[PDB]
From a paper:
Siastatin B is a potent and effective iminosugar inhibitor of three diverse glycosidase classes, namely, sialidases, β-d-glucuronidases, and N-acetyl-glucosaminidases. Surprisingly, siastatin B also inhibits both β-glucuronidases and human heparanase, which cleave β-glucuronic acid residues but not sialic acid or N-acetylated sugars. Herein, we show through crystallographic analysis of protein-inhibitor complexes that siastatin B generates both a hemiaminal and a 3-geminal diol iminosugar (3-GDI) that are, rather than the parent compound, directly responsible for enzyme inhibition. Notably, 3-GDIs are a new class of iminosugar glycoside hydrolase inhibitor, that have been shown to inhibit both GH2 and GH79 β-glucuronidases.
Numbering used by the authors: 17 to 475
The structure:
């Protein structure tokens, strides 16, 4: 009904980046490692949610709580630890001290085996010692093994140590570089092959750029963070603003691309979500987050990112997966945007140009030549008030199907489906609605409701 009529032109000759198979990922608080039941081979529910997000992917463990977690080689989990549900750190005050045990690391290894995911593991540079980091790294490497361990990170958001009471106001990149080298040196004595990434901050000029320049021979990739919300001085983030382009993201991405050109280091977005402080109720925990997250995954893949890790845990407002081993796990709305990406699969991005779209400017579209040879198109109609009718040219196929990413309202906290079905227990998901996209004159026409997504697959 009264859609904006737009054109989408796919160009199979306009080659973009190849999405790596381990692009997807999640980030969790290191405090969660206090509970050996969470990242465990026994946590079949959570493992299933990860496998549905990707047969390959990366689990990053870090966050603010990584400055408050203290590995101890003799420790055993307490009764309290065995029930801990560590949600995103809200950033209001110091996290609780937690202990990480051998048992938790042993169980993490088995969780990585059950999921097939690789690991980015934070070490406690904020408050811990080099020697303990070396010992923790040694045990992780011993246990998890080089093939599954992608990187250690030496501190989380070190540019914010002072804001969070971890370093004095004078702490700057030069001070952090000294800490980093002390930790690096200690760890490499115990773990000569230890891989690193950093600086595990948002892009900025005073930390990330000089980090890359100084440590490019010592790290495997650059790790960056991104939250769509800006500083606390901004108007409170809304769904409307979450759907819009974020010029800061665009600039930071360009910055990362220049770092890669200068240093050779690829970049991964190792911690991201919509809003700070564990998210914003009525924004982060809504269907709009699915549109935002799915679109972000493709925007960053098209920009040459190696991958992404959406922060979460517990029942945090922005978590993709919520729950506990005792109570079970569920897919929150954001998960469904990641599910659309998962179902599209890997391949090479292609040119996909929108026209006649000024009245529906928040529609995005990405075309992909899948590794199976089939063309897919992921569309995010992020316009909150405009339906669209998309005239698709540049695809020659006898049959196109669509899987829709839907909820009845953008701010819904539930009622989210993909392919006509919710995700069930343990990540199980099957499409239940089959819809063909009408074809005529070598073109296709796709209707999309306001605030919806679609994944098209062409035979
Ligand atoms: O929700 C947030 O604000 C995020 C910011 N980044 C930190 O590394 C996380 O621990 C968490 O506090």
């Amino acid at each position: 009904s009264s859609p904006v009529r737009v054109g989408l032109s796919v160009d199979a000759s306009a080659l973009g980046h190849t999405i790596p198979p381990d692009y997807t990922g999640l980030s969790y608080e290191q405090a969660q490692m206090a509970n050996p039941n969470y990242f465990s081979g026994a946590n079949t529910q959570l493992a299933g949610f990860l496998r549905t997000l990707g047969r390959q992917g990366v689990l990053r463990i870090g966050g603010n709580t990584s400055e408050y977690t203290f590995w101890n080689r003799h420790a055993k989990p307490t009764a309290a630890d065995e029930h801990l549900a560590a949600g995103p750190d809200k950033g209001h005050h110091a996290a609780a001290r937690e202990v990480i045990t051998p048992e938790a690391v042993n169980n993490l290894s088995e969780f990585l085996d059950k999921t097939g995911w690789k690991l980015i593991y934070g070490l406690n540079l904020g408050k811990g010692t080099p020697e303990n980091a070396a010992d923790e790294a040694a045990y992780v490497m011993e246990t998890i093994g080089a093939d599954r361990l992608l990187a250690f990170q030496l501190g989380n958001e070190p540019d914010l140590f002072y804001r969070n009471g971890i370093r004095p106001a004078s702490y700057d990149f030069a001070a952090y570089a000294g800490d980093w080298q002390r930790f690096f040196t200690a760890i490499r004595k115990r773990v000569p092959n230890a891989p690193f990434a950093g600086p595990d901050t948002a892009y900025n000029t005073k930390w990330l750029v000089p980090f890359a320049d100084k440590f490019k021979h010592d790290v495997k990739f650059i790790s960056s963070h991104y939250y769509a919300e800006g500083p606390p001085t901004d108007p409170s983030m809304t769904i409307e603003r979450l759907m819009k382009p974020n010029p800061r993201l665009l600039g930071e991405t360009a910055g990362l691309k220049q770092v890669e050109a200068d240093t050779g280091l690829p970049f991964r977005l190792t911690e991201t979500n919509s809003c700070y402080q564990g998210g914003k109720q009525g924004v982060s925990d809504t269907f709009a987050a699915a549109l935002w997250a799915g679109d972000l995954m493709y925007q960053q893949a098209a920009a040459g990112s190696t991958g992404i890790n959406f922060h979460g845990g517990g029942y945090g407002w922005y978590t993709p997966v919520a729950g506990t081993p005792e109570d079970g796990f569920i897919a929150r709305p954001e998960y469904y945007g990641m599910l659309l990406f998962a179902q599209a699969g890997a391949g090479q991005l292609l040119g996909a140009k929108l026209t006649d779209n000024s009245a529906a400017p928040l529609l995005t579209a990405y075309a992909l030549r899948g590794t199976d040879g089939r063309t897919r198109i992921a569309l995010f109609n992020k316009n909150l008030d405009a339906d669209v009718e998309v005239a698709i040219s540049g695809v020659a196929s006898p049959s196109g199907t669509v899987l829709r990413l839907e909820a009845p309202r953008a701010d819904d906290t539930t009622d989210v489906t993909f392919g006509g079905a919710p995700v069930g227990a343990s990540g199980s998901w099957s499409p239940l609605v089959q819809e063909y996209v009408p074809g005529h004159s070598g073109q296709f026409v796709l209707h999309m409701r306001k605030a919806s997504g679609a994944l098209l697959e062409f035979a």
